[PDB]
Design an enzyme around this catalytic site. Structure first.
Site, short mmCIF file in Angstrom:
data_model
loop_
_atom_site.label_atom_id
_atom_site.label_comp_id
_atom_site.label_asym_id
_atom_site.label_seq_id
_atom_site.Cartn_x
_atom_site.Cartn_y
_atom_site.Cartn_z
N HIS A 169 -26.98 -21.94 45.88
CA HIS A 169 -27.82 -21.95 46.68
C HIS A 169 -27.94 -23.10 47.98
CE1 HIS A 169 -32.43 -20.89 47.45
NE2 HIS A 169 -32.26 -22.10 48.12
N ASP A 211 -28.83 -27.48 39.21
CA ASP A 211 -29.80 -26.75 39.73
C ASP A 211 -30.24 -25.76 38.60
OD1 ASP A 211 -31.24 -24.68 41.06
OD2 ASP A 211 -29.81 -24.63 42.70
N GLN A 234 -32.87 -20.97 38.20
CA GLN A 234 -32.97 -19.58 37.66
C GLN A 234 -32.76 -19.63 36.16
OE1 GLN A 234 -33.64 -16.74 39.38
NE2 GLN A 234 -34.04 -18.12 41.15
N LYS A 279 -41.25 -20.10 40.11
CA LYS A 279 -40.31 -18.82 39.64
C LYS A 279 -40.55 -18.47 38.15
CE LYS A 279 -36.88 -19.45 43.04
NZ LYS A 279 -35.65 -19.76 43.71
N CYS A 337 -29.96 -17.21 50.78
CA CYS A 337 -29.88 -18.58 50.77
C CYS A 337 -28.49 -19.08 50.12
CB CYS A 337 -30.94 -19.37 50.06
SG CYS A 337 -32.67 -18.92 50.54
#
Lengths: 414, 414
Positions: free
Chosen positions: B130, B207, B210, B233, B372
């Site tokens: 991203h 990161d 997700q 999220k 993104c």
């Protein structure tokens, strides 16, 4: 009394029905919440708008997307327009959403400050500033080997025009100043200070956290370069603030947080930035919080600042007079009729932390400590103080409850 | 079917009753919300905790204050403890609240990066990242004249162990990598990549935006240096995220935002910082949002990740198989049984923006664009793609509604 008349005229009992949090007891006593300067309470109208967002159109924000996404984008854009109108900014793109006043001022000090301050330049501040409007300027001065200068204060904690004119000079690049003191209640003449800054080729960054909740703001009249405030102090949700900046300035400033939304194009090694205002808004926005803050603005606008200012001033003068009648109370700052809705004080021979503890046992919420203004405490020659603050949901009963609790505290510690 | 059995076992209809937003029509059709990767929907349990905060104990946060202030402080501290337990961080003070994953990674790249990267050092990233996990590293490389290196990807968009070992070397200072791709559904082996980083004297910044919503995380097992994710999220409010960092690292890192709460002492020209974690939390906290995020964590924990992973994998395989049966659908990334709950695709001869528009007319929410991830789009040799994503409130009916809408879209554009 005069205060009962002011209550009736303002319809304060109908305002209080919008704030369910106030309908409770603390330590078996009715709650008298006198700590709005720290954070305001939140009306059901704002809570209903937040609930509706999460129950009806939450989605991420992007122009031209699926149905809920386009409703969320509309709500976010409408919220920015509401803020623009609230402060009479010329352009939509002059309103930046941030985490709060502290994040706003830090963005000015990093992005504007690093590009416009060099060795031997001066930054003007005051000893009444909150930490959020001192420490970023200290850090900019250290990065650049620039000099921090303080506008001398009068004995009542105000800024004399001659001290303002003597401290600002042709070396000044930035004047950073409170619109209203969170402690003294001083209302600075930011329109005049802006004029003096501009005469010397400086810009003005205003800390408006204690002004935006309480008085009408007009960026174009004031001619501020930057203006910062927080939503949670003006009936809105936690986690959101605003930075206003003149478009000409924001266009030249570089972002300091990188990611989605604030970019236009990204390759493996390079990126370009989005247009204002999104250039300064990295990542997923504060979507629910912006929508709630717009509802808080509509709540304040519906009452209007002339009515809010009159009511707050009547409460403040009443509280100042009643507290002044207690032998041993010292109030800091300007006279009763030259201040915002805050009274910072000490009680003779009672530590302010013990005042705060004792009045909470009587249901009254005040704060004690340095109020994030340690240089001001040193200027007053104290470590800590106690602080009561007033807003639109406070009453004569709340003030009388504080007064009785202070008299009881004097008795307990005598 | 197998998918009806999976629905029944997961009790998905009872989960959906917690999400009132799903009980609506869009364009006259039932809503099939397949855009959770962009932001999740929010259960009534989280909304009730947010409402209770604003109706019962909103106040600013500080240890030892009036009654509502001490309840708000308790709720905020309890929320940080909930997060610490959720990711099995060793210490309370290793959990930092931020605005989101983007703000978390930017804090690592500024504060850790500027103190630990010099000319000729290498930063390892990937083309699946991203923007939030690319552009901060681009900017750190530019500030320091350091070099950005990309781990080559396999044809299916995964990272071969030999490509990982060849790209990381003794010049590497930082490996910054997705735990799970927001586009391909690739699940990277961050535990093994961390080991390779550490062998070369680098740190790893993950990161996890997700991953945190969908799988159990254990910071101590993984041995990540930094780990970042977003509340919106994972069933939580907008405006909040987390940065996990090892205590040893966070202790040496300098804050980059200055003001109240993050200081210990302030004089006219100098300041000292608070202890972890508050050193990195300037201004008034995200108080309501942290309290809501803790409730979102308890919602996920009550179902448990073994049940969530099984259900999501059944949905994902079902959707992958049904979409693969449409002539002209191309799905990007690994096979059906080697991916997270996302399917990014294109339909032959139909622009993905027109796919997204067309399926929204059928009530289905998907996203189209670059997600993104512009360098990933270039790696796929496309500009844009369409993307459907699954979470705990999605059903076979939602997938069948997308499939029928894609067949209708093929027909409309033929």
């Amino acid at each position: 009394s005069h205060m009962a008349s002011a209550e009736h005229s303002f319809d304060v009992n109908e305002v209080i029905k919008d704030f369910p949090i106030l309908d409770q007891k603390v330590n078996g006593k009715r709650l008298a919440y006198l700590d709005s300067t720290a954070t305001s309470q939140t009306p059901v109208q704002v809570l209903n708008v937040l609930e509706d967002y999460y129950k009806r159109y939450n989605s991420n924000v992007h122009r031209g997307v699926h149905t809920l996404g386009s409703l969320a984008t509309d709500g976010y854009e409408n919220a920015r327009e509401t803020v623009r109108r609230f402060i009479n900014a010329k352009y939509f793109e002059e309103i930046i959403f941030t985490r709060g006043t502290t994040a706003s001022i830090n963005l000015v000090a990093h992005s504007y400050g690093d590009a416009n301050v060099e060795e031997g330049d001066e930054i003007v501040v005051t000893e009444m500033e909150h930490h959020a409007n001192i420490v970023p300027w200290q850090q900019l001065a250290k990065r650049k080997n620039a000099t921090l200068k303080f506008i001398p204060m009068t004995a009542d904690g105000e800024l004399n025009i001659e001290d303002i004119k003597q401290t600002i000079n042709d070396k000044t690049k930035i004047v950073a100043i409170a619109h209203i003191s969170n402690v003294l209640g001083t209302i600075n003449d930011v329109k005049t200070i802006a004029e003096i800054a501009h005469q010397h080729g400086a810009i003005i960054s205003v800390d408006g956290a204690q002004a935006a909740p309480h008085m009408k703001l007009d960026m174009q009249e004031m001619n501020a370069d930057f203006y910062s405030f927080s939503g949670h102090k003006m009936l809105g949700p936690t986690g959101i603030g605003v930075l206003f900046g003149k478009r000409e300035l924001l266009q030249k400033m570089e972002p300091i947080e990188f990611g989605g939304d604030m970019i236009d194009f990204v390759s493996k090694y390079d990126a370009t930035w989005a247009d204002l205002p999104t250039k300064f808004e990295a990542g997923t926005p504060l979507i629910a919080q912006a929508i709630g803050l717009a509802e808080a603005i509509r709540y304040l606008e519906r009452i209007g600042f002339d009515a809010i200012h009159k009511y707050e001033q009547e409460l403040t003068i009443y509280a100042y007079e009643q507290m002044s009648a207690i032998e041993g109370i010292e109030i800091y700052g300007p006279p009763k009729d030259r201040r915002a809705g805050v009274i910072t004080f000490n009680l003779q021979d009672v530590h302010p932390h013990d005042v705060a503890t004792a009045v909470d046992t009587e249901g009254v919420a005040v704060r004690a400590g340095h109020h994030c203004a340690q240089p001001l405490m040193k200027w007053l020659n104290v470590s800590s103080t106690a602080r009561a603050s007033f807003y639109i949901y406070n009453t004569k009963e709340d003030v009388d409850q504080l007064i009785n609790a202070l008299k009881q505290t004097k008795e307990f510690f005598s």
